[PDB]
mmCIF file of all heavy atoms in Angstrom:
data_model
loop_
_atom_site.group_PDB
_atom_site.id
_atom_site.type_symbol
_atom_site.label_atom_id
_atom_site.label_comp_id
_atom_site.label_asym_id
_atom_site.label_seq_id
_atom_site.Cartn_x
_atom_site.Cartn_y
_atom_site.Cartn_z
ATOM 1 N N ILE B 30 100.750 106.057 105.095
ATOM 2 C CA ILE B 30 99.833 106.193 103.968
ATOM 3 C C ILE B 30 99.491 107.659 103.726
ATOM 4 O O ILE B 30 99.470 108.124 102.580
ATOM 5 C CB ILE B 30 98.571 105.344 104.203
ATOM 6 C CG1 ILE B 30 98.931 103.857 104.233
ATOM 7 C CG2 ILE B 30 97.529 105.620 103.130
ATOM 8 C CD1 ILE B 30 97.749 102.946 104.462
ATOM 9 N N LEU B 31 99.230 108.413 104.797
ATOM 10 C CA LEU B 31 98.902 109.826 104.640
ATOM 11 C C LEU B 31 100.105 110.625 104.152
ATOM 12 O O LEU B 31 99.967 111.500 103.290
ATOM 13 C CB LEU B 31 98.381 110.398 105.958
ATOM 14 C CG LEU B 31 97.025 109.885 106.446
ATOM 15 C CD1 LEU B 31 96.636 110.563 107.750
ATOM 16 C CD2 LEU B 31 95.956 110.100 105.386
ATOM 17 N N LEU B 32 101.292 110.338 104.687
ATOM 18 C CA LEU B 32 102.484 111.075 104.291
ATOM 19 C C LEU B 32 103.032 110.627 102.943
ATOM 20 O O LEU B 32 103.811 111.367 102.332
ATOM 21 C CB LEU B 32 103.563 110.946 105.369
ATOM 22 C CG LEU B 32 103.193 111.604 106.701
ATOM 23 C CD1 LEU B 32 104.253 111.348 107.759
ATOM 24 C CD2 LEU B 32 102.965 113.096 106.514
ATOM 25 N N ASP B 33 102.648 109.441 102.465
ATOM 26 C CA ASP B 33 102.993 109.063 101.098
ATOM 27 C C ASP B 33 102.264 109.943 100.093
ATOM 28 O O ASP B 33 102.824 110.301 99.050
ATOM 29 C CB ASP B 33 102.671 107.588 100.853
ATOM 30 C CG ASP B 33 103.785 106.664 101.308
ATOM 31 O OD1 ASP B 33 104.873 107.168 101.656
ATOM 32 O OD2 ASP B 33 103.574 105.433 101.314
ATOM 33 N N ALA B 34 101.013 110.304 100.391
ATOM 34 C CA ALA B 34 100.270 111.194 99.507
ATOM 35 C C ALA B 34 100.838 112.607 99.545
ATOM 36 O O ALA B 34 100.892 113.289 98.515
ATOM 37 C CB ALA B 34 98.791 111.197 99.890
ATOM 38 N N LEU B 35 101.264 113.065 100.726
ATOM 39 C CA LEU B 35 101.866 114.390 100.832
ATOM 40 C C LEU B 35 103.174 114.464 100.055
ATOM 41 O O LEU B 35 103.420 115.434 99.329
ATOM 42 C CB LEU B 35 102.098 114.746 102.300
ATOM 43 C CG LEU B 35 102.823 116.067 102.564
ATOM 44 C CD1 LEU B 35 102.011 117.243 102.042
ATOM 45 C CD2 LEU B 35 103.125 116.232 104.046
ATOM 46 N N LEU B 36 104.024 113.447 100.193
ATOM 47 C CA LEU B 36 105.307 113.428 99.506
ATOM 48 C C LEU B 36 105.196 112.982 98.054
ATOM 49 O O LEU B 36 106.201 113.013 97.335
ATOM 50 C CB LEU B 36 106.291 112.534 100.265
ATOM 51 C CG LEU B 36 106.586 113.042 101.679
ATOM 52 C CD1 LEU B 36 107.523 112.109 102.424
ATOM 53 C CD2 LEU B 36 107.162 114.450 101.627
ATOM 54 N N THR B 37 104.011 112.562 97.610
ATOM 55 C CA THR B 37 103.796 112.323 96.188
ATOM 56 C C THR B 37 103.471 113.626 95.469
ATOM 57 O O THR B 37 104.021 113.911 94.399
ATOM 58 C CB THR B 37 102.673 111.303 95.983
ATOM 59 O OG1 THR B 37 103.051 110.049 96.563
ATOM 60 C CG2 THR B 37 102.391 111.107 94.501
ATOM 61 N N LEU B 38 102.586 114.436 96.055
ATOM 62 C CA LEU B 38 102.262 115.731 95.466
ATOM 63 C C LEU B 38 103.401 116.724 95.658
ATOM 64 O O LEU B 38 103.691 117.526 94.763
ATOM 65 C CB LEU B 38 100.969 116.273 96.075
ATOM 66 C CG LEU B 38 99.717 115.411 95.904
ATOM 67 C CD1 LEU B 38 98.563 115.977 96.716
ATOM 68 C CD2 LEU B 38 99.338 115.300 94.434
ATOM 69 N N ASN B 39 104.059 116.686 96.816
ATOM 70 C CA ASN B 39 105.157 117.596 97.141
ATOM 71 C C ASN B 39 106.327 116.782 97.676
ATOM 72 O O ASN B 39 106.485 116.625 98.895
ATOM 73 C CB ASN B 39 104.717 118.655 98.152
ATOM 74 C CG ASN B 39 103.534 119.465 97.666
ATOM 75 O OD1 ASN B 39 102.382 119.129 97.943
ATOM 76 N ND2 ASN B 39 103.811 120.539 96.937
ATOM 77 N N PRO B 40 107.169 116.244 96.789
ATOM 78 C CA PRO B 40 108.326 115.465 97.260
ATOM 79 C C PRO B 40 109.354 116.298 98.003
ATOM 80 O O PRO B 40 110.172 115.730 98.737
ATOM 81 C CB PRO B 40 108.914 114.885 95.965
ATOM 82 C CG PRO B 40 107.812 114.990 94.951
ATOM 83 C CD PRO B 40 107.044 116.218 95.324
ATOM 84 N N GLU B 41 109.341 117.619 97.837
ATOM 85 C CA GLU B 41 110.314 118.496 98.475
ATOM 86 C C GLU B 41 109.924 118.886 99.895
ATOM 87 O O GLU B 41 110.668 119.634 100.538
ATOM 88 C CB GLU B 41 110.513 119.762 97.635
ATOM 89 C CG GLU B 41 109.364 120.763 97.718
ATOM 90 C CD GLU B 41 108.109 120.289 97.006
ATOM 91 O OE1 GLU B 41 108.213 119.394 96.140
ATOM 92 O OE2 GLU B 41 107.018 120.812 97.315
ATOM 93 N N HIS B 42 108.791 118.401 100.398
ATOM 94 C CA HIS B 42 108.348 118.744 101.746
ATOM 95 C C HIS B 42 109.316 118.139 102.754
ATOM 96 O O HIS B 42 109.309 116.925 102.987
ATOM 97 C CB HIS B 42 106.925 118.247 101.979
ATOM 98 C CG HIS B 42 106.177 119.025 103.017
ATOM 99 N ND1 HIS B 42 106.438 118.910 104.366
ATOM 100 C CD2 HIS B 42 105.175 119.928 102.904
ATOM 101 C CE1 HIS B 42 105.630 119.710 105.038
ATOM 102 N NE2 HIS B 42 104.853 120.338 104.175
ATOM 103 N N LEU B 43 110.156 118.986 103.352
ATOM 104 C CA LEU B 43 111.211 118.490 104.228
ATOM 105 C C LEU B 43 110.646 117.984 105.551
ATOM 106 O O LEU B 43 111.097 116.957 106.071
ATOM 107 C CB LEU B 43 112.245 119.592 104.462
ATOM 108 C CG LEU B 43 113.570 119.205 105.114
ATOM 109 C CD1 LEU B 43 114.243 118.096 104.322
ATOM 110 C CD2 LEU B 43 114.477 120.421 105.213
ATOM 111 N N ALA B 44 109.658 118.688 106.110
ATOM 112 C CA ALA B 44 109.066 118.249 107.370
ATOM 113 C C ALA B 44 108.275 116.958 107.203
ATOM 114 O O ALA B 44 108.191 116.159 108.143
ATOM 115 C CB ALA B 44 108.175 119.348 107.947
ATOM 116 N N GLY B 45 107.687 116.737 106.026
ATOM 117 C CA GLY B 45 106.950 115.507 105.795
ATOM 118 C C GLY B 45 107.842 114.288 105.684
ATOM 119 O O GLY B 45 107.434 113.182 106.050
ATOM 120 N N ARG B 46 109.066 114.468 105.184
ATOM 121 C CA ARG B 46 109.992 113.345 105.076
ATOM 122 C C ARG B 46 110.517 112.925 106.443
ATOM 123 O O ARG B 46 110.699 111.730 106.701
ATOM 124 C CB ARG B 46 111.146 113.698 104.140
ATOM 125 C CG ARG B 46 110.733 113.838 102.688
ATOM 126 C CD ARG B 46 111.942 113.883 101.779
ATOM 127 N NE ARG B 46 111.569 113.880 100.371
ATOM 128 C CZ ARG B 46 111.413 112.784 99.640
ATOM 129 N NH1 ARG B 46 111.597 111.579 100.155
ATOM 130 N NH2 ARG B 46 111.063 112.901 98.362
ATOM 131 N N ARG B 47 110.779 113.892 107.327
ATOM 132 C CA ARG B 47 111.242 113.553 108.670
ATOM 133 C C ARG B 47 110.176 112.786 109.441
ATOM 134 O O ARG B 47 110.487 111.831 110.162
ATOM 135 C CB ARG B 47 111.634 114.821 109.430
ATOM 136 C CG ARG B 47 112.695 115.669 108.751
ATOM 137 C CD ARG B 47 113.102 116.836 109.636
ATOM 138 N NE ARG B 47 113.795 117.879 108.890
ATOM 139 C CZ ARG B 47 115.106 117.913 108.686
ATOM 140 N NH1 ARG B 47 115.904 116.965 109.152
ATOM 141 N NH2 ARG B 47 115.628 118.924 107.998
ATOM 142 N N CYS B 48 108.910 113.187 109.297
ATOM 143 C CA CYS B 48 107.837 112.519 110.026
ATOM 144 C C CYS B 48 107.573 111.125 109.470
ATOM 145 O O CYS B 48 107.306 110.188 110.232
ATOM 146 C CB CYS B 48 106.567 113.368 109.984
ATOM 147 S SG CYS B 48 105.287 112.851 111.153
ATOM 148 N N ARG B 49 107.642 110.965 108.146
ATOM 149 C CA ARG B 49 107.444 109.642 107.563
ATOM 150 C C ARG B 49 108.617 108.721 107.863
ATOM 151 O O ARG B 49 108.425 107.511 108.033
ATOM 152 C CB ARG B 49 107.225 109.750 106.053
ATOM 153 C CG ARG B 49 106.886 108.421 105.394
ATOM 154 C CD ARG B 49 106.695 108.557 103.894
ATOM 155 N NE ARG B 49 107.943 108.831 103.194
ATOM 156 C CZ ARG B 49 108.077 108.822 101.874
ATOM 157 N NH1 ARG B 49 107.058 108.542 101.078
ATOM 158 N NH2 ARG B 49 109.261 109.106 101.340
ATOM 159 N N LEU B 50 109.831 109.273 107.933
ATOM 160 C CA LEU B 50 111.001 108.463 108.255
ATOM 161 C C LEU B 50 110.856 107.809 109.623
ATOM 162 O O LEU B 50 111.147 106.618 109.784
ATOM 163 C CB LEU B 50 112.261 109.327 108.197
ATOM 164 C CG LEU B 50 113.601 108.670 108.531
ATOM 165 C CD1 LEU B 50 113.782 107.386 107.743
ATOM 166 C CD2 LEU B 50 114.734 109.637 108.242
ATOM 167 N N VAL B 51 110.397 108.570 110.619
ATOM 168 C CA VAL B 51 110.144 107.992 111.933
ATOM 169 C C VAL B 51 108.961 107.034 111.878
ATOM 170 O O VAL B 51 108.942 106.018 112.586
ATOM 171 C CB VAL B 51 109.925 109.110 112.969
ATOM 172 C CG1 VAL B 51 109.659 108.523 114.348
ATOM 173 C CG2 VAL B 51 111.134 110.034 113.006
ATOM 174 N N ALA B 52 107.966 107.324 111.036
ATOM 175 C CA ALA B 52 106.839 106.411 110.886
ATOM 176 C C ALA B 52 107.275 105.094 110.256
ATOM 177 O O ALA B 52 106.746 104.030 110.599
ATOM 178 C CB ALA B 52 105.737 107.067 110.054
ATOM 179 N N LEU B 53 108.239 105.143 109.333
ATOM 180 C CA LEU B 53 108.770 103.911 108.759
ATOM 181 C C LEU B 53 109.593 103.129 109.775
ATOM 182 O O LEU B 53 109.608 101.893 109.738
ATOM 183 C CB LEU B 53 109.611 104.223 107.521
ATOM 184 C CG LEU B 53 108.851 104.704 106.284
ATOM 185 C CD1 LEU B 53 109.820 105.091 105.177
ATOM 186 C CD2 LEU B 53 107.887 103.633 105.801
ATOM 187 N N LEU B 54 110.282 103.826 110.683
ATOM 188 C CA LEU B 54 111.053 103.138 111.714
ATOM 189 C C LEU B 54 110.137 102.393 112.676
ATOM 190 O O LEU B 54 110.454 101.278 113.107
ATOM 191 C CB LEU B 54 111.927 104.136 112.474
ATOM 192 C CG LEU B 54 113.073 104.791 111.702
ATOM 193 C CD1 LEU B 54 113.744 105.858 112.551
ATOM 194 C CD2 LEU B 54 114.082 103.745 111.261
ATOM 195 N N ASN B 55 109.000 102.994 113.024
ATOM 196 C CA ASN B 55 108.038 102.361 113.914
ATOM 197 C C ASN B 55 107.175 101.321 113.213
ATOM 198 O O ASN B 55 106.394 100.636 113.882
ATOM 199 C CB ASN B 55 107.143 103.425 114.554
ATOM 200 C CG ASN B 55 107.935 104.464 115.323
ATOM 201 O OD1 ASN B 55 109.082 104.230 115.705
ATOM 202 N ND2 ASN B 55 107.324 105.618 115.561
ATOM 203 N N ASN B 56 107.293 101.187 111.893
ATOM 204 C CA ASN B 56 106.531 100.212 111.128
ATOM 205 C C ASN B 56 107.378 99.019 110.701
ATOM 206 O O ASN B 56 106.940 98.231 109.856
ATOM 207 C CB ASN B 56 105.905 100.881 109.901
ATOM 208 C CG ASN B 56 104.695 100.131 109.379
ATOM 209 O OD1 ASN B 56 104.013 99.430 110.127
ATOM 210 N ND2 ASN B 56 104.423 100.274 108.087
ATOM 211 N N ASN B 57 108.582 98.878 111.261
ATOM 212 C CA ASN B 57 109.477 97.756 110.969
ATOM 213 C C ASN B 57 109.827 97.691 109.483
ATOM 214 O O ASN B 57 109.933 96.611 108.898
ATOM 215 C CB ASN B 57 108.879 96.430 111.447
ATOM 216 C CG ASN B 57 108.657 96.396 112.947
ATOM 217 O OD1 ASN B 57 108.534 97.438 113.592
ATOM 218 N ND2 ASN B 57 108.607 95.195 113.510
ATOM 219 N N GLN B 58 110.006 98.855 108.868
ATOM 220 C CA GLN B 58 110.419 98.953 107.471
ATOM 221 C C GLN B 58 111.805 99.588 107.408
ATOM 222 O O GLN B 58 111.993 100.692 106.891
ATOM 223 C CB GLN B 58 109.387 99.749 106.665
ATOM 224 C CG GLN B 58 107.994 99.138 106.678
ATOM 225 C CD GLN B 58 107.036 99.847 105.743
ATOM 226 O OE1 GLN B 58 105.946 100.257 106.145
ATOM 227 N NE2 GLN B 58 107.434 99.991 104.485
ATOM 228 N N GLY B 59 112.790 98.866 107.947
ATOM 229 C CA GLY B 59 114.144 99.389 107.999
ATOM 230 C C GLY B 59 114.818 99.468 106.645
ATOM 231 O O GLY B 59 115.674 100.331 106.426
ATOM 232 N N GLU B 60 114.452 98.576 105.721
ATOM 233 C CA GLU B 60 115.053 98.607 104.391
ATOM 234 C C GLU B 60 114.627 99.845 103.613
ATOM 235 O O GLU B 60 115.364 100.308 102.735
ATOM 236 C CB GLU B 60 114.692 97.336 103.617
ATOM 237 C CG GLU B 60 113.276 97.307 103.046
ATOM 238 C CD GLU B 60 112.201 97.279 104.118
ATOM 239 O OE1 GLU B 60 112.477 96.777 105.228
ATOM 240 O OE2 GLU B 60 111.081 97.763 103.849
ATOM 241 N N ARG B 61 113.452 100.395 103.920
ATOM 242 C CA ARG B 61 112.973 101.605 103.266
ATOM 243 C C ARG B 61 113.373 102.858 104.035
ATOM 244 O O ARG B 61 113.667 103.893 103.426
ATOM 245 C CB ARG B 61 111.452 101.547 103.101
ATOM 246 C CG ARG B 61 110.853 102.745 102.381
ATOM 247 C CD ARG B 61 109.342 102.622 102.270
ATOM 248 N NE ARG B 61 108.743 103.796 101.647
ATOM 249 C CZ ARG B 61 107.440 103.967 101.470
ATOM 250 N NH1 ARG B 61 106.564 103.054 101.857
ATOM 251 N NH2 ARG B 61 107.005 105.083 100.891
ATOM 252 N N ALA B 62 113.396 102.779 105.368
ATOM 253 C CA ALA B 62 113.814 103.921 106.172
ATOM 254 C C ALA B 62 115.298 104.216 105.999
ATOM 255 O O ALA B 62 115.730 105.356 106.203
ATOM 256 C CB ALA B 62 113.489 103.675 107.645
ATOM 257 N N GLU B 63 116.092 103.209 105.628
ATOM 258 C CA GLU B 63 117.511 103.443 105.388
ATOM 259 C C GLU B 63 117.722 104.351 104.183
ATOM 260 O O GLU B 63 118.535 105.281 104.234
ATOM 261 C CB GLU B 63 118.237 102.112 105.192
ATOM 262 C CG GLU B 63 119.726 102.248 104.916
ATOM 263 C CD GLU B 63 120.413 100.906 104.753
ATOM 264 O OE1 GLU B 63 119.783 99.873 105.065
ATOM 265 O OE2 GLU B 63 121.581 100.883 104.311
ATOM 266 N N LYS B 64 116.994 104.103 103.092
ATOM 267 C CA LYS B 64 117.120 104.954 101.914
ATOM 268 C C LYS B 64 116.505 106.328 102.145
ATOM 269 O O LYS B 64 116.940 107.311 101.535
ATOM 270 C CB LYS B 64 116.481 104.275 100.703
ATOM 271 C CG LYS B 64 117.112 102.940 100.345
ATOM 272 C CD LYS B 64 116.465 102.329 99.113
ATOM 273 C CE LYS B 64 117.124 101.009 98.744
ATOM 274 N NZ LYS B 64 116.513 100.402 97.530
ATOM 275 N N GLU B 65 115.495 106.418 103.013
ATOM 276 C CA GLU B 65 114.923 107.720 103.341
ATOM 277 C C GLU B 65 115.852 108.516 104.248
ATOM 278 O O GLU B 65 115.958 109.741 104.116
ATOM 279 C CB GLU B 65 113.552 107.543 103.993
ATOM 280 C CG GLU B 65 112.461 107.110 103.028
ATOM 281 C CD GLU B 65 112.139 108.176 101.997
ATOM 282 O OE1 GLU B 65 112.277 109.376 102.315
ATOM 283 O OE2 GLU B 65 111.748 107.814 100.867
ATOM 284 N N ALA B 66 116.530 107.839 105.179
ATOM 285 C CA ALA B 66 117.492 108.526 106.034
ATOM 286 C C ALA B 66 118.691 109.012 105.231
ATOM 287 O O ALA B 66 119.168 110.134 105.435
ATOM 288 C CB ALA B 66 117.939 107.605 107.169
#
Side-chain angles (χ1 to χ4, degrees):
Chain B
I30 295 180
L31 292 181
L32 295 176
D33 276 351
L35 176 63
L36 298 178
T37 297
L38 300 172
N39 303 92
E41 75 289 340
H42 206 286
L43 192 56
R46 291 192 174 270
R47 303 185 197 271
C48 193
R49 185 181 70 171
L50 179 50
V51 180
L53 290 175
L54 293 174
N55 302 340
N56 203 27
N57 298 23
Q58 300 187 233
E60 77 294 333
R61 182 181 177 182
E63 179 179 349
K64 300 182 179 181
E65 287 294 329

